[PDB]
Amino acid sequence: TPEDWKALAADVRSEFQWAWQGYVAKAWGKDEINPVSGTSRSFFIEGHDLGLSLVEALDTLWIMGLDAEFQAGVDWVKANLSFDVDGNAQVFETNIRLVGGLLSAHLASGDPVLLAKARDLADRLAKAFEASPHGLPWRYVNLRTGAVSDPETNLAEIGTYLSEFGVLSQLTGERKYFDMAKRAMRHTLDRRSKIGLMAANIHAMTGAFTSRNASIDVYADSFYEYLWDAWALFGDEDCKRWAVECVDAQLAHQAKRYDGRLWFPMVDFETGAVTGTAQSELAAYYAGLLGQVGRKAQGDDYLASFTYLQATFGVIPESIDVTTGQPRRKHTGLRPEYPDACLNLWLIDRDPRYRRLAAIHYREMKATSRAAFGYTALKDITTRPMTQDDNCPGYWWSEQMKYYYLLFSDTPRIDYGQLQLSTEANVLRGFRKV
Ligand SMILES: OC[C@@H]1[C@@H](O)[C@H](O)[C@H](O)c2nccn21
Ligand SMILES: [Ca+2]
Ligand SMILES: [Ca+2]
Ligand code: NA
């Protein structure tokens, strides 16, 4: 019997609503639910929650037509969410989760307050960029005082702002946000090696690399996405060029086959020598990026490596050794990157193969991560049953349930031709209001 995709979408929505109910019951206004114990935890600042999962969920709720739930969350934000807080926040996470989550909710709803709050937060984060003579953000900033800490940063944490900041520039009319984000990316791109790679670790004050390791995953992932995404969102010609150049350098110097499968281990950014044997599950986003930038055959080949892991292990291991294709770790983070790739590749040609693969992933999530009050990360994927930890990461609310729903629902609330997703799956273009 052919899969009824619409029924599967309805199941995703049902499960999401059920999870939301658990969040409301156990963790209202708190950063994350621990759905086994039925408790909450903080994410950014211990004891000073910022409604993380609520904010992350908003655009997902809207897309699913969970309008009452969406509005309850928006109304909570409008009444309660403030960033005048004497505590340190990680700049990267704060941007991709809270600035981006408020922006997608703003674009869905039109509510000016959500933009006001996104912009307030971005202005607090801007102090981290201003504290570097290179415009490379420090990793942490005090939201109230602007004090910075930890300049030993990385490509992802200096280069995952341009989508949110660029949308802020579009909406506000102030180019400063776009410029600040682009300047940081240009810094490292200008320091590419002769073979076109960047090391993944960089110092905000010296502006120099602090390792020799080029990476597509750990320390770097979304830098490469945001180059393409800035072309797509803003028509930025430099970013279009850079996106393709960076990917072609990776395909030339980091693509390696082991036991017939494509992997992208870390390499020395100048010599191209392999410097590591680990690949993170997190790398799976890159299969989708490869398609986006016009390297779809390679993207499908890379997806196939992860499809192998899913078929073999059920849940994709958090990290594997590329030389053996086996797990390096037994726990998971309830990770979304496989359906991320499936959606991104499916948006190119609408091949139902990607739906089939994502349906496996969704069903496996249901079979392994369901707990009393929501969905949880795993302790051990090698036991049967797989043992659970007790945490629903904030990104679950923005990412995989949205990916599944977008893959299966064909919702009229999204213009699929105009759809743009941040690295946290915040929708930054493509809402079709009712
Ligand atoms: O696993 C999802 C999380 C999210 O915060 C987001 O997708 C982000 O791009 C990322 N990089 C590595 C891990 N993650
Ligand atoms: Ca991502
Ligand atoms: Ca992407
Ligand atoms: Na979101």
Our answer on whether the CB atom of 336 is closer than 6 Å to any ligand 1 atom is: yes
Given strand 88-90, what is the order of strands in its sheet? 88-90, 140-142, 148-149
Three-class secondary structure assignment of the chain: CCCCHHHHHHHHHHHHHHHHHHHHHHHCCCCEEECCCCEEECCCCCCCCCCHHHHHHHHHHHHCCCHHHHHHHHHHHHHHCCCCCCCEEEHHHHHHHHHHHHHHHHHHHCCHHHHHHHHHHHHHHHHHHHCCCCCCCCCEEECCCCCEECCEEEHHHHCCCHHHHHHHHHHHCCCHHHHHHHHHHHHHHCCCCCCCCCCCEEECCCCCECCCEECCCCCCHHHHHHHHHHHHHHCCHHHHHHHHHHHHHHHHHCCEEECCEEECCCEECCCCCECCCEEEHHHHHHHHHHHHCCCHHHHHHHHHHHHHHHHHHCCCCCEEECCCCEECCCCCCCCCHHHHHHHHHHHHHCCHHHHHHHHHHHHHHHHHHEECCEECCEEECCCCCCEECCCCCHHHHHCHHHHHHHHHHCCCCECCCCCEECCCCCEEECECCC
Instruction: Give all domains of the chain, ordered by start, each with its CATH number.
Output: 1-434 (1.50.10.10)
Our answer on whether the CB atom of 124 is closer than 6 Å to any ligand 1 atom is: no
Our answer on whether the CB atom of 395 is closer than 6 Å to any ligand 1 atom is: yes
Mutate to test the pocket of ligand 1, among 55, 164, 222, 316 (most ligand atoms within 8 A of CB): 222
Our answer on whether the CB atom of 222 is closer than 6 Å to any ligand 1 atom is: yes
Neighbours of ion ligand 4 (CB under 5 A): 56, 59, 101, 398, 426
Q: According to the entry, how was the structure determined?
A: X-ray
* Protein residue whose Cα sits closest to atom 14 of ligand 1: 282
> Resolution to 1 decimal, in Å?
1.1
